[PDB]
């Protein structure tokens, strides 16, 4: 038995989110083999539109098929076999389309076809990979180019308007913070449903109700907006859900992201109390329960970011139900003063190389030397926590010099800030 499965060749993921920042996107589709193939081993790939119905049902999603005429495989879709790497691949090109309605994820389900008889394909999962395509050609001001480090920013939204993301621009106009987090919605026990729910304090709820004026301006400029989830002093927790409790909590998180048109979640396993082990939705707090929640959340919103703060028991188990953590931890950010590290088949591109506590001051600066050190290490991210306009002097001083290194353009001093819950751009510092 020579077992094959399909994955994107560049990312090595069976489910790959693709962001078009240009007219074409090129990658390979890769079939892996468990055994060395023989001279006769062969297979092809094709778009499998029928499979999308099955995929959407399995994930409770509603991705529309990406126009097939915009996808082309080299070599008629035939996979070129490399027996010395137990794999076969073909180049695939995605072209940006014409009148595709924007802010919408399209699917390219890809199937192994016409495989020789020596190849076994154990199930429909092994037979397919999927690309989830988003046209980002117009949302480019957060996009600072291919291969660069990216910013990840927490707002304490009890106090600070996330439109202050827009205060942080390079001298060339690009937005520094690729990803921002609304810190935080909570996990808490709901007695009447008998399970955990998402519980939003009035500040979080106000932002969500008013996402069109206080959040969507960011997304239109390319910023990803995540809902932060945080433990909240009861029996429920992000690292103490049973398999069934995690499946349900995961669907509630995805539903928030869909309802308020957000881009994903950050899980932070802090401030929960001991679970009630008699409850079928809870279990012993463990990094394995955290990984289960991450896996289930990614299954429920596969086009959206699943990200964790590496603290508590939120991060460290690398496999759930045979699926490696690279498929369900998009970004991991570490505690102030340290670099995140990868697990399973993740790379440092999924990892923060610095975490700055902007409100209390710990964790270093995004200096020219730290920027080069992090580039040298292969790190994908820098993280900041709780900036506020009243501390812009300290915050921006901690960003001097790094932007030249990372992007060829330093962070510009701020000239705008926003007040809580107020869409008005005020002059910084005058209007403070
Ligand atoms: C990724 C990451 O960073 N993760 C964590 C972060 O969580 C952490 O952030 C800090 O967390 C602590 C702890 O937060 C938890 O516990 C809080 C306390 O709860 C307990 O008491 C409650 C009753 O008081 C009780 O109900 C509860 O059951 C507990 O027993 C919770 O309040 C908190 O939940 C709330 O916030 C979270 C989000 O943070 C929401 O999800 C949740 O729904 C809820 O709304 C959470 O469970 C916090 O205590 C820290 O908060 C301080 O700093 C943040 C900025 O980061 C501010 O936004 C806060 O307001 C707070 O600042 C203090 O604010 C007061 C009032 O404005 C200031 O007092 C004034 O002080 C001056 C002098 O200085 C004068 O005297 C004046 O008269 C006073 O009014 C005070 O100065 C402020 N202090 C500071 C330090 O600025 C953080 O949120 C961070 C830590 O770096 O990193 C990781 O660990």
Short mmCIF file of C-alpha atoms and ligand atoms in Angstrom, two decimals:
data_model
loop_
_atom_site.label_atom_id
_atom_site.label_comp_id
_atom_site.label_asym_id
_atom_site.label_seq_id
_atom_site.Cartn_x
_atom_site.Cartn_y
_atom_site.Cartn_z
CA UNK A 1 0.00 0.00 0.00
CA UNK A 2 1.51 3.32 -1.21
CA UNK A 3 -0.66 6.03 0.30
CA UNK A 4 -0.93 9.47 -1.29
CA UNK A 5 -2.40 12.74 -0.14
CA UNK A 6 -2.61 16.19 -1.75
CA UNK A 7 -1.36 19.48 -0.33
CA UNK A 8 -0.26 22.86 -1.51
CA UNK A 9 3.43 22.55 -2.37
CA UNK A 10 4.63 25.98 -1.18
CA UNK A 11 2.94 25.98 2.23
CA UNK A 12 2.66 22.16 2.63
CA UNK A 13 -0.93 22.66 3.89
CA UNK A 14 -3.99 20.70 2.78
CA UNK A 15 -6.06 23.88 3.25
CA UNK A 16 -4.31 27.05 2.08
CA UNK A 17 -5.60 30.64 2.25
CA UNK A 18 -4.41 32.60 -0.81
CA UNK A 19 -4.31 36.40 -0.85
CA UNK A 20 -4.03 37.98 -4.27
CA UNK A 21 -1.95 41.12 -4.09
CA UNK A 22 -1.39 41.01 -7.86
CA UNK A 23 -2.82 39.71 -11.12
CA UNK A 24 -1.46 36.15 -10.72
CA UNK A 25 -0.52 33.86 -7.84
CA UNK A 26 1.72 30.87 -8.57
CA UNK A 27 2.24 27.73 -6.50
CA UNK A 28 2.50 23.98 -6.95
CA UNK A 29 0.09 21.22 -6.02
CA UNK A 30 1.94 18.31 -4.41
CA UNK A 31 1.05 14.65 -4.02
CA UNK A 32 3.00 12.92 -1.24
CA UNK A 33 3.67 9.19 -1.25
CA UNK A 34 4.40 6.96 1.73
CA UNK A 35 6.54 4.60 -0.39
CA UNK A 36 9.02 5.21 -3.16
CA UNK A 37 7.06 5.03 -6.45
CA UNK A 38 8.09 2.98 -9.45
CA UNK A 39 8.80 4.13 -13.01
CA UNK A 40 5.12 3.69 -13.96
CA UNK A 41 3.67 5.69 -11.05
CA UNK A 42 1.55 8.58 -12.28
CA UNK A 43 -1.39 10.86 -11.45
CA UNK A 44 -3.10 14.10 -12.51
CA UNK A 45 -4.90 16.88 -10.62
CA UNK A 46 -8.11 18.66 -11.57
CA UNK A 47 -10.52 21.17 -10.11
CA UNK A 48 -13.26 19.16 -8.39
CA UNK A 49 -16.25 21.51 -8.22
CA UNK A 50 -18.61 18.76 -7.10
CA UNK A 51 -16.50 18.34 -3.99
CA UNK A 52 -17.19 21.94 -2.84
CA UNK A 53 -20.76 21.06 -1.79
CA UNK A 54 -19.30 18.28 0.33
CA UNK A 55 -16.60 20.55 1.79
CA UNK A 56 -19.04 23.36 2.60
CA UNK A 57 -21.40 20.95 4.35
CA UNK A 58 -18.58 19.38 6.32
CA UNK A 59 -17.38 22.78 7.55
CA UNK A 60 -20.76 24.58 7.71
CA UNK A 61 -19.27 27.12 5.28
CA UNK A 62 -20.63 28.67 2.11
CA UNK A 63 -17.61 29.35 -0.09
CA UNK A 64 -18.46 30.03 -3.71
CA UNK A 65 -16.44 28.28 -6.35
CA UNK A 66 -13.67 30.42 -7.78
CA UNK A 67 -14.19 30.88 -11.57
CA UNK A 68 -12.49 27.79 -12.99
CA UNK A 69 -11.29 29.66 -16.09
CA UNK A 70 -9.03 31.71 -13.77
CA UNK A 71 -7.05 28.59 -12.64
CA UNK A 72 -4.61 26.78 -14.91
CA UNK A 73 -2.26 23.87 -14.23
CA UNK A 74 0.94 23.38 -16.16
CA UNK A 75 1.40 20.11 -18.11
CA UNK A 76 -2.34 19.41 -18.45
CA UNK A 77 -2.52 18.85 -14.71
CA UNK A 78 -0.11 15.89 -14.88
CA UNK A 79 2.02 15.45 -11.75
CA UNK A 80 5.74 15.12 -12.38
CA UNK A 81 7.08 12.35 -10.14
CA UNK A 82 10.26 12.68 -8.09
CA UNK A 83 10.89 9.24 -6.65
CA UNK A 84 13.89 10.55 -4.64
CA UNK A 85 11.43 12.70 -2.59
CA UNK A 86 8.42 10.34 -2.56
CA UNK A 87 6.35 13.13 -4.17
CA UNK A 88 4.90 14.49 -7.42
CA UNK A 89 3.85 18.03 -8.28
CA UNK A 90 2.49 20.39 -10.92
CA UNK A 91 2.55 24.20 -11.14
CA UNK A 92 -0.76 25.95 -10.57
CA UNK A 93 -1.53 29.56 -11.40
CA UNK A 94 -4.39 31.60 -10.00
CA UNK A 95 -5.32 34.73 -11.94
CA UNK A 96 -7.26 37.58 -10.39
CA UNK A 97 -10.76 37.95 -11.84
CA UNK A 98 -13.00 40.67 -13.21
CA UNK A 99 -16.27 41.28 -11.43
CA UNK A 100 -15.86 39.09 -8.36
CA UNK A 101 -17.75 40.64 -5.43
CA UNK A 102 -15.19 41.86 -2.90
CA UNK A 103 -14.46 40.87 0.74
CA UNK A 104 -15.44 37.31 -0.09
CA UNK A 105 -13.57 33.98 0.00
CA UNK A 106 -13.68 31.70 -3.06
CA UNK A 107 -12.73 28.02 -3.16
CA UNK A 108 -10.55 25.96 -5.50
CA UNK A 109 -11.06 22.30 -4.52
CA UNK A 110 -8.32 20.20 -6.16
CA UNK A 111 -8.51 16.41 -6.58
CA UNK A 112 -6.03 13.69 -7.46
CA UNK A 113 -7.32 12.04 -10.65
CA UNK A 114 -6.26 9.15 -12.93
CA UNK A 115 -3.75 7.86 -10.39
CA UNK A 116 -1.97 4.60 -11.22
CA UNK A 117 -3.08 1.44 -9.45
CA UNK A 118 -0.04 1.28 -7.17
CA UNK A 119 -1.36 4.42 -5.39
CA UNK A 120 -3.90 4.18 -2.58
CA UNK A 121 -6.02 7.19 -1.62
CA UNK A 122 -7.52 6.34 1.72
CA UNK A 123 -10.47 8.76 1.75
CA UNK A 124 -11.93 11.88 0.20
CA UNK A 125 -9.78 14.00 2.51
CA UNK A 126 -6.56 12.48 1.18
CA UNK A 127 -7.82 12.92 -2.39
CA UNK A 128 -8.20 16.74 -2.13
CA UNK A 129 -6.58 19.90 -1.02
CA UNK A 130 -8.31 23.27 -1.12
CA UNK A 131 -7.31 26.89 -1.78
CA UNK A 132 -9.42 29.65 -0.19
CA UNK A 133 -8.92 32.69 -2.39
CA UNK A 134 -9.31 36.36 -1.44
CA UNK A 135 -8.81 39.31 -3.76
CA UNK A 136 -6.71 41.85 -1.82
CA UNK A 137 -5.59 44.00 -4.75
CA UNK A 138 -7.52 47.01 -3.45
CA UNK A 139 -6.83 46.50 0.29
CA UNK A 140 -3.11 46.99 0.10
CA UNK A 141 -2.04 49.70 2.51
CA UNK A 142 -1.32 47.15 5.28
CA UNK A 143 0.53 45.01 2.67
CA UNK A 144 4.25 45.83 2.86
CA UNK A 145 5.45 43.26 0.31
CA UNK A 146 6.35 39.58 0.08
CA UNK A 147 8.61 38.08 2.73
CA UNK A 148 8.51 40.98 5.20
CA UNK A 149 7.80 40.77 8.91
CA UNK A 150 4.26 41.68 9.94
CA UNK A 151 2.74 43.42 12.93
CA UNK A 152 0.29 41.97 15.44
CA UNK A 153 -1.36 44.45 17.85
CA UNK A 154 -3.68 43.99 20.86
CA UNK A 155 -6.04 46.84 21.83
CA UNK A 156 -7.42 46.95 25.34
CA UNK A 157 -10.78 47.89 23.91
CA UNK A 158 -12.22 48.69 27.31
CA UNK A 159 -10.15 51.90 26.88
CA UNK A 160 -8.74 52.31 23.35
CA UNK A 161 -10.43 52.71 19.97
CA UNK A 162 -8.96 50.20 17.47
CA UNK A 163 -9.14 52.88 14.76
CA UNK A 164 -5.90 54.01 16.41
CA UNK A 165 -4.40 51.26 14.26
CA UNK A 166 -4.46 54.03 11.59
CA UNK A 167 -2.11 56.24 13.70
CA UNK A 168 0.79 53.88 12.76
CA UNK A 169 2.06 54.47 9.21
CA UNK A 170 5.48 54.20 7.62
CA UNK A 171 6.92 57.30 5.95
CA UNK A 172 5.80 55.77 2.66
CA UNK A 173 2.21 55.59 3.93
CA UNK A 174 1.94 51.81 4.57
CA UNK A 175 0.16 50.73 7.77
CA UNK A 176 2.48 49.08 10.29
CA UNK A 177 0.02 46.70 12.01
CA UNK A 178 -1.02 43.88 9.67
CA UNK A 179 -3.22 42.21 12.32
CA UNK A 180 -4.99 43.72 15.33
CA UNK A 181 -6.89 42.04 18.18
CA UNK A 182 -9.98 43.28 20.05
CA UNK A 183 -8.92 42.38 23.62
CA UNK A 184 -11.13 40.83 24.70
CA UNK A 185 -14.36 38.92 24.49
CA UNK A 186 -14.64 36.21 27.18
CA UNK A 187 -15.51 32.55 27.60
CA UNK A 188 -18.01 32.15 30.47
CA UNK A 189 -20.55 29.54 31.51
CA UNK A 190 -24.14 29.96 30.26
CA UNK A 191 -26.45 28.21 32.76
CA UNK A 192 -29.56 28.06 30.58
CA UNK A 193 -27.88 26.44 27.54
CA UNK A 194 -25.75 24.34 29.93
CA UNK A 195 -22.41 25.14 28.29
CA UNK A 196 -19.76 27.82 27.70
CA UNK A 197 -20.65 30.84 25.61
CA UNK A 198 -18.87 33.87 24.26
CA UNK A 199 -19.61 36.73 26.69
CA UNK A 200 -18.87 40.28 25.51
CA UNK A 201 -18.55 43.16 27.94
CA UNK A 202 -20.30 46.40 26.89
CA UNK A 203 -17.17 47.81 25.27
CA UNK A 204 -16.56 44.70 23.18
CA UNK A 205 -20.25 44.54 22.27
CA UNK A 206 -20.33 48.21 21.26
CA UNK A 207 -17.41 47.67 18.86
CA UNK A 208 -19.09 44.61 17.37
CA UNK A 209 -22.50 46.32 16.99
CA UNK A 210 -20.69 49.26 15.38
CA UNK A 211 -18.16 47.31 13.38
CA UNK A 212 -19.15 49.18 10.20
CA UNK A 213 -17.78 52.46 11.52
CA UNK A 214 -15.14 51.36 14.05
CA UNK A 215 -13.67 48.15 12.50
CA UNK A 216 -14.43 47.88 8.80
CA UNK A 217 -12.29 50.96 7.97
CA UNK A 218 -9.30 48.86 9.08
CA UNK A 219 -10.26 45.82 6.99
CA UNK A 220 -10.78 48.02 3.92
CA UNK A 221 -7.11 49.10 4.29
CA UNK A 222 -5.97 45.44 4.52
CA UNK A 223 -5.77 45.12 8.33
CA UNK A 224 -7.00 41.81 9.72
CA UNK A 225 -9.27 42.34 12.73
CA UNK A 226 -9.46 39.43 15.19
CA UNK A 227 -11.73 38.98 18.21
CA UNK A 228 -9.70 38.27 21.30
CA UNK A 229 -11.03 35.51 23.57
CA UNK A 230 -9.89 35.46 27.19
CA UNK A 231 -10.76 33.42 30.29
CA UNK A 232 -13.01 35.22 32.75
CA UNK A 233 -13.07 33.87 36.34
CA UNK A 234 -15.52 30.95 36.14
CA UNK A 235 -15.44 27.21 35.50
CA UNK A 236 -14.97 27.72 31.72
CA UNK A 237 -11.65 28.05 29.95
CA UNK A 238 -9.93 27.97 26.60
CA UNK A 239 -7.73 25.04 27.72
CA UNK A 240 -10.38 23.06 29.59
CA UNK A 241 -13.11 22.26 27.02
CA UNK A 242 -14.01 18.65 26.31
CA UNK A 243 -13.97 17.53 22.72
CA UNK A 244 -17.68 18.26 22.46
CA UNK A 245 -17.50 21.54 24.36
CA UNK A 246 -14.69 22.65 22.05
CA UNK A 247 -16.63 21.80 18.89
CA UNK A 248 -19.57 23.93 20.07
CA UNK A 249 -17.52 26.79 21.42
CA UNK A 250 -15.57 26.80 18.14
CA UNK A 251 -18.79 27.20 16.13
CA UNK A 252 -19.87 30.11 18.34
CA UNK A 253 -16.51 31.84 17.71
CA UNK A 254 -16.80 31.31 13.97
CA UNK A 255 -20.34 32.63 14.04
CA UNK A 256 -19.16 35.85 15.72
CA UNK A 257 -16.49 36.24 13.05
CA UNK A 258 -19.09 35.76 10.31
CA UNK A 259 -21.78 37.96 11.90
CA UNK A 260 -19.45 40.93 12.51
CA UNK A 261 -17.30 40.39 9.39
CA UNK A 262 -14.03 39.76 11.25
CA UNK A 263 -10.87 37.87 10.27
CA UNK A 264 -10.29 35.36 13.05
CA UNK A 265 -9.56 34.92 16.75
CA UNK A 266 -6.81 35.12 19.35
CA UNK A 267 -7.06 32.64 22.23
CA UNK A 268 -5.52 33.69 25.57
CA UNK A 269 -5.70 31.08 28.35
CA UNK A 270 -5.66 33.33 31.41
CA UNK A 271 -8.00 34.06 34.37
CA UNK A 272 -10.18 30.98 34.18
CA UNK A 273 -10.94 28.99 37.33
CA UNK A 274 -10.96 25.22 37.83
CA UNK A 275 -13.51 23.40 35.66
CA UNK A 276 -16.42 21.33 36.93
CA UNK A 277 -15.20 17.93 35.72
CA UNK A 278 -18.72 16.62 36.09
CA UNK A 279 -19.73 18.84 33.13
CA UNK A 280 -19.65 17.21 29.67
CA UNK A 281 -18.42 20.44 28.08
CA UNK A 282 -15.36 20.74 30.36
CA UNK A 283 -12.35 18.58 31.00
CA UNK A 284 -9.06 18.64 32.89
CA UNK A 285 -7.17 21.82 31.88
CA UNK A 286 -4.48 20.73 29.44
CA UNK A 287 -2.57 21.93 26.44
CA UNK A 288 -4.24 19.04 24.61
CA UNK A 289 -7.69 20.59 25.28
CA UNK A 290 -6.36 23.92 24.02
CA UNK A 291 -5.08 22.31 20.84
CA UNK A 292 -8.48 20.65 20.40
CA UNK A 293 -10.18 24.07 20.55
CA UNK A 294 -7.72 25.52 18.03
CA UNK A 295 -8.24 22.57 15.68
CA UNK A 296 -12.03 22.78 15.99
CA UNK A 297 -12.00 26.54 15.48
CA UNK A 298 -9.96 26.24 12.29
CA UNK A 299 -12.40 23.56 11.04
CA UNK A 300 -15.28 26.02 11.63
CA UNK A 301 -13.63 29.03 9.93
CA UNK A 302 -10.90 27.60 7.70
CA UNK A 303 -10.54 30.90 5.76
CA UNK A 304 -9.86 32.85 8.99
CA UNK A 305 -6.92 33.18 11.40
CA UNK A 306 -6.60 30.97 14.47
CA UNK A 307 -3.95 32.52 16.68
CA UNK A 308 -2.80 32.03 20.25
CA UNK A 309 -0.93 33.86 22.98
CA UNK A 310 1.67 31.36 24.22
CA UNK A 311 0.81 31.44 27.95
CA UNK A 312 -1.21 29.31 30.32
CA UNK A 313 -1.90 25.96 28.64
CA UNK A 314 -2.90 27.46 25.30
CA UNK A 315 0.06 26.26 23.17
CA UNK A 316 2.35 23.25 22.86
CA UNK A 317 0.50 20.10 21.63
CA UNK A 318 1.29 19.68 17.94
CA UNK A 319 -1.35 17.27 16.62
CA UNK A 320 -5.12 16.80 16.93
CA UNK A 321 -6.85 13.82 15.28
CA UNK A 322 -3.79 13.28 13.09
CA UNK A 323 -3.69 16.91 11.86
CA UNK A 324 -0.50 18.89 12.43
CA UNK A 325 -0.53 22.29 14.15
CA UNK A 326 0.61 24.09 10.98
CA UNK A 327 -2.96 23.57 9.73
CA UNK A 328 -4.62 25.24 12.73
CA UNK A 329 -2.19 27.71 14.39
CA UNK A 330 -1.69 30.56 11.94
CA UNK A 331 0.24 32.86 14.33
CA UNK A 332 1.61 32.30 17.82
CA UNK A 333 2.74 35.30 19.91
CA UNK A 334 4.87 34.95 23.00
CA UNK A 335 4.94 36.56 26.37
CA UNK A 336 6.73 39.93 26.73
CA UNK A 337 10.50 39.51 26.63
CA UNK A 338 10.59 36.33 24.49
CA UNK A 339 10.24 34.96 20.97
CA UNK A 340 7.56 32.46 20.11
CA UNK A 341 8.78 29.13 18.81
CA UNK A 342 7.10 26.69 16.40
CA UNK A 343 5.72 23.18 16.99
CA UNK A 344 4.74 20.32 14.70
CA UNK A 345 5.59 21.41 11.14
CA UNK A 346 5.15 25.12 11.82
CA UNK A 347 8.00 27.48 11.00
CA UNK A 348 9.25 30.66 12.60
CA UNK A 349 7.21 32.52 9.95
CA UNK A 350 4.21 31.72 12.21
CA UNK A 351 6.05 33.13 15.26
CA UNK A 352 6.55 36.52 16.88
CA UNK A 353 10.20 37.50 17.43
CA UNK A 354 9.38 40.20 19.99
CA UNK A 355 6.37 41.07 22.13
CA UNK A 356 6.13 44.65 23.40
CA UNK A 357 3.98 45.62 26.38
CA UNK A 358 3.16 49.17 25.35
CA UNK A 359 1.13 50.10 28.43
CA UNK A 360 3.53 48.95 31.17
CA UNK A 361 6.78 49.01 29.14
CA UNK A 362 8.32 45.52 29.12
CA UNK A 363 9.62 43.47 26.23
CA UNK A 364 12.10 45.56 24.21
CA UNK A 365 11.92 47.83 21.19
CA UNK A 366 11.55 47.37 17.44
CA UNK A 367 15.05 48.77 16.90
CA UNK A 368 17.20 48.45 13.76
CA UNK A 369 19.25 45.72 15.47
CA UNK A 370 16.25 43.77 16.77
CA UNK A 371 14.63 43.97 13.33
CA UNK A 372 17.71 42.51 11.61
CA UNK A 373 18.11 39.90 14.35
CA UNK A 374 14.49 38.81 13.81
CA UNK A 375 14.84 38.77 10.02
CA UNK A 376 17.99 36.68 10.51
CA UNK A 377 16.03 34.25 12.66
CA UNK A 378 13.27 33.80 10.09
CA UNK A 379 10.55 35.27 12.33
CA UNK A 380 7.23 36.25 10.77
CA UNK A 381 5.80 38.63 13.37
CA UNK A 382 6.29 41.36 15.96
CA UNK A 383 3.65 41.75 18.63
CA UNK A 384 2.58 44.80 20.63
CA UNK A 385 0.11 45.06 23.49
CA UNK A 386 -2.19 47.88 24.68
CA UNK A 387 -0.96 51.06 22.95
CA UNK A 388 -2.93 54.18 23.78
CA UNK A 389 -2.79 57.76 22.44
CA UNK A 390 -1.82 59.07 25.89
CA UNK A 391 1.39 56.99 25.57
CA UNK A 392 2.17 57.55 21.88
CA UNK A 393 5.48 59.21 22.81
CA UNK A 394 6.75 56.06 24.54
CA UNK A 395 5.11 53.72 22.02
CA UNK A 396 6.57 55.34 18.93
CA UNK A 397 10.00 55.81 20.48
CA UNK A 398 9.99 51.98 20.81
CA UNK A 399 9.42 51.76 17.03
CA UNK A 400 12.31 53.96 15.86
CA UNK A 401 14.76 52.48 13.38
CA UNK A 402 13.07 49.07 12.95
CA UNK A 403 10.90 50.08 9.99
CA UNK A 404 13.88 51.10 7.85
CA UNK A 405 15.29 47.59 8.29
CA UNK A 406 12.02 45.67 7.86
CA UNK A 407 10.52 47.75 5.06
CA UNK A 408 12.95 50.42 3.87
CA UNK A 409 10.72 53.05 5.48
CA UNK A 410 10.70 54.09 9.13
CA UNK A 411 7.53 54.49 11.17
CA UNK A 412 6.35 58.10 10.90
CA UNK A 413 5.53 60.14 14.01
CA UNK A 414 1.75 60.08 14.59
CA UNK A 415 -0.48 62.93 13.49
CA UNK A 416 -3.91 61.35 14.15
CA UNK A 417 -5.58 59.56 17.06
CA UNK A 418 -9.11 58.41 17.88
CA UNK A 419 -11.14 58.65 21.09
CA UNK A 420 -13.04 55.71 22.53
CA UNK A 421 -16.05 54.68 20.42
CA UNK A 422 -15.66 57.81 18.31
CA UNK A 423 -14.94 57.59 14.53
CA UNK A 424 -13.60 61.18 14.37
CA UNK A 425 -9.89 61.54 13.44
CA UNK A 426 -8.40 63.99 15.94
CA UNK A 427 -5.06 65.80 15.53
CA UNK A 428 -2.23 64.26 17.53
CA UNK A 429 -1.03 65.77 19.90
CA UNK A 430 -3.12 68.93 19.71
CA UNK A 431 -6.52 67.34 20.41
CA UNK A 432 -5.41 65.15 23.30
C1 LIG B 1 -1.89 38.99 25.79
C2 LIG B 1 -1.86 39.61 27.16
O1 LIG B 1 -1.31 40.69 27.37
N1 LIG B 1 -2.47 38.92 28.13
C3 LIG B 1 -2.37 39.28 29.54
C4 LIG B 1 -3.25 40.48 29.85
O2 LIG B 1 -4.49 39.97 30.25
C5 LIG B 1 -2.69 41.43 30.88
O3 LIG B 1 -3.59 42.54 31.02
C6 LIG B 1 -3.87 42.99 32.32
O4 LIG B 1 -4.75 42.09 32.96
C7 LIG B 1 -5.07 42.46 34.31
C8 LIG B 1 -5.95 41.37 34.86
O5 LIG B 1 -7.13 41.28 34.05
C9 LIG B 1 -8.01 40.26 34.42
O6 LIG B 1 -8.44 40.46 35.75
C10 LIG B 1 -9.05 41.74 35.97
C11 LIG B 1 -9.38 41.82 37.44
O7 LIG B 1 -10.49 40.96 37.72
C12 LIG B 1 -10.63 40.62 39.07
O8 LIG B 1 -11.25 41.68 39.77
C13 LIG B 1 -12.53 42.04 39.23
C14 LIG B 1 -13.01 43.24 40.00
O9 LIG B 1 -12.06 44.29 39.98
C15 LIG B 1 -13.48 40.85 39.32
O10 LIG B 1 -14.72 41.19 38.70
C16 LIG B 1 -12.87 39.63 38.63
O11 LIG B 1 -13.70 38.49 38.84
C17 LIG B 1 -11.47 39.36 39.15
O12 LIG B 1 -11.53 38.91 40.50
C18 LIG B 1 -10.30 41.87 35.10
O13 LIG B 1 -10.85 43.17 35.26
C19 LIG B 1 -9.94 41.63 33.64
O14 LIG B 1 -11.16 41.57 32.88
C20 LIG B 1 -11.58 42.76 32.25
O15 LIG B 1 -10.70 43.08 31.19
C21 LIG B 1 -10.59 42.03 30.22
C22 LIG B 1 -9.54 42.47 29.22
O16 LIG B 1 -8.37 42.96 29.88
C23 LIG B 1 -11.95 41.78 29.57
O17 LIG B 1 -11.84 40.70 28.66
C24 LIG B 1 -12.98 41.47 30.64
O18 LIG B 1 -14.28 41.36 30.05
C25 LIG B 1 -12.99 42.54 31.73
O19 LIG B 1 -13.51 43.76 31.20
C26 LIG B 1 -9.20 40.31 33.47
O20 LIG B 1 -10.08 39.22 33.73
C27 LIG B 1 -5.78 43.81 34.31
O21 LIG B 1 -6.02 44.21 35.66
C28 LIG B 1 -4.93 44.85 33.60
O22 LIG B 1 -5.74 46.03 33.42
C29 LIG B 1 -5.12 47.28 33.61
O23 LIG B 1 -4.43 47.65 32.43
C30 LIG B 1 -5.28 47.68 31.28
C31 LIG B 1 -4.39 47.98 30.09
O24 LIG B 1 -3.68 46.82 29.67
C32 LIG B 1 -6.37 48.73 31.47
O25 LIG B 1 -7.25 48.70 30.35
C33 LIG B 1 -7.15 48.46 32.75
O26 LIG B 1 -8.07 49.52 33.00
C34 LIG B 1 -6.20 48.30 33.93
O27 LIG B 1 -5.58 49.57 34.17
C35 LIG B 1 -5.86 50.19 35.41
O28 LIG B 1 -7.03 50.97 35.30
C36 LIG B 1 -7.35 51.67 36.51
C37 LIG B 1 -8.67 52.37 36.28
O29 LIG B 1 -8.65 53.13 35.08
C38 LIG B 1 -6.22 52.63 36.87
O30 LIG B 1 -6.49 53.20 38.15
C39 LIG B 1 -6.13 54.55 38.35
O31 LIG B 1 -4.81 54.61 38.85
C40 LIG B 1 -4.35 55.95 39.07
C41 LIG B 1 -2.90 55.86 39.49
O32 LIG B 1 -2.18 54.97 38.65
C42 LIG B 1 -5.23 56.63 40.12
O33 LIG B 1 -5.07 55.96 41.37
C43 LIG B 1 -6.69 56.58 39.69
O34 LIG B 1 -7.52 57.09 40.73
C44 LIG B 1 -7.11 55.15 39.35
O35 LIG B 1 -8.42 55.15 38.81
C45 LIG B 1 -4.89 51.89 36.97
O36 LIG B 1 -3.82 52.82 37.14
C46 LIG B 1 -4.65 51.08 35.70
N2 LIG B 1 -3.44 50.29 35.81
C47 LIG B 1 -2.52 50.21 34.84
C48 LIG B 1 -1.47 49.15 35.01
O37 LIG B 1 -2.54 50.96 33.87
C49 LIG B 1 -4.51 44.37 32.22
O38 LIG B 1 -5.64 44.32 31.35
C50 LIG B 1 -1.35 41.93 30.42
C51 LIG B 1 -0.48 42.57 31.46
O39 LIG B 1 0.59 43.23 30.89
O40 LIG B 1 -0.58 40.88 29.82
C52 LIG B 1 -0.91 39.52 29.93
O41 LIG B 1 -0.64 39.06 31.09
#
